[model samples]
Target: ESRKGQERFNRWFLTGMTVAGVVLLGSLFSRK
Candidate 1:
C-alpha cells in the first residue's frame, strides 16, 4: 500500500542519472 512518493522519486532519480550519463558520454561523439 506504500507504492508512492519514495518509489517514484527513486525511479526518477535513476532515469535522470542515466540520461545525464549518456549526455556526458555523447559529447565525445558529437559530429562537430
Candidate 2:
C-alpha cells in the first residue's frame, strides 16, 4: 500500500473534524 494517499486523507479528515467541532460549539453557544 502507498502512504501518499493516507497523508492526503488525514488532512481532509482533520479539516472535517475541525469544521464539525466549530459547528457543534456554535450550536451550543447559540442556545444558551
Candidate 3:
C-alpha cells in the first residue's frame, strides 16, 4: 500500500464527512 496515497485518502474522507455533517446540521436548523 502507498502511504502517501492512504494519507491523502484519509484526509479526503474526513473532509467529506465534515462537509456532510455541516450540510446536515444546516438543514436541520433551517427547518425552523
Candidate 4:
C-alpha cells in the first residue's frame, strides 16, 4: 500500500483547518 495519498490528504486537511480557524477568529474579533 502507498502512503503518499494519505500524506497529501493530511497536509491539505491540516492547512484548510488552520485557515478556517484564522477566519473564524478574525470574524469574532471584528464583531463589536
Q: What Cα-based lDDT does every candidate model obtain?
A: 0.76, 0.76, 0.75, 0.77
Q: Which tens-of-lDDT digit does each residue in 1-32 have in candidate 3?
A: 55565544457668899888899888888756
Q: How many backbone clashes does candidate 1 have?
A: 0
Error of 3 at 24 (Å): 0.4
Off by over 4 Å in 3: 1-13
How does candidate 2 score on lDDT? 0.76
List clashing residue pairs in candidate 1: none
Candidate 2 vs candidate 3, TM-score winner? 2
All candidates: TM-score: 0.37, 0.37, 0.36, 0.36
- Candidate 2 lDDT tens digits, 1-32: 77566645557668899888899888887765
* Model 3 residue-pair collision total: 0
Better candidate by lDDT, 2 or 3: 2
Per-residue accuracy of model 1 over 4-28 as CA lDDT, tens digit each: 6664555766888989888988988
Summed over model 4, clashes come to 0
Best model number under lDDT: 4
What's the number of clashes in each of the models? 0, 0, 0, 0
lDDT per residue (tens digit) for residues 1-32 in model 4: 68566645567668889898899888888857
